[PDB]
Amino acid sequence: QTQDFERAAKKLSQKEINRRMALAQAYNDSLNNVHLEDPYEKKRIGIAEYARMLEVSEKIGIISVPKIGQKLPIFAGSSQEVLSKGAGHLEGTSLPIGGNSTHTVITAHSGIPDKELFSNLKKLKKGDKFYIQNIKETIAYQVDQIKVVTPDNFSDLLVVPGHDYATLLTCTPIMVNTHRLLVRGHRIPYKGHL
Structure with missing residues (x-):
């Protein structure tokens, strides 16, 4: 269910990608x-x-x-x-x-x-990788921390100065959902604690 995104992203001009990415950067800042x-x-x-x-x-x-x-x-x-x-x-x-x-x-x-x-x-597991494709490019992350936390603990989802992180978040245990599983990776070139 992703080919439509790829096709549409490729049709954006470079000026339009730049404009959109500028808005996204400003939003992040x-x-x-x-x-x-x-x-x-x-x-x-x-x-x-x-x-x-x-x-x-x-x-x-x-x-x-x-x-x-x-x-x-x-x-x-x-x-x-x-x-x-x-x-x-x-x-x-x-x-x-x-x-x-x-x-x-x-x-x-x-x-x-x-x-x-x-x-x-x-x-x-640590060392495994995941990839996010946006309208501009694909960015890659390498897992470096896996934590299970309570649903009211956002500490591990916050911005960490000087780092480029991505976390994959889901519920755990399966079907029970008292807790949240957080798989964090740090940016790499695209080619409690558990």
Whole structure:
């Protein structure tokens, strides 16, 4: 469900990619993490507008996790509608374009029967890799920390100065969902603690 994004991204001119990426950079520089909310709170209380500059074909990117054979569309926000059809981006975290002092968080469900999504995220280990494609390019991350945290602990999702991080976020234990699994990687060239 990702070929449409690729096709549409390739049709943008370089000036338009630059304009959009500028808006995304400006958004990241003004990021306020007050938007941080747990997507998997059962009794949690709209359409996401904050990442429109990165959107083509309704999507802001593609998340590839080769070890578990996933290549999923990324949609803005983390609404139930989004999480039923692919991966979401956690509003309040950096948009997935990389850069110094950025930390983007991409999330998908582990406990929807009959949809793989991030059901097997817990198979990831330090040294494994994942990739995010946005309208400009594909950026790569190498897993360097795996943590299981409570749903009200956002500490490990915040921007770390001087680093370019990405975390893949899901619920755990499978079908129980009392906790959150956070698989963090650091930027590499594209070619509690567990």
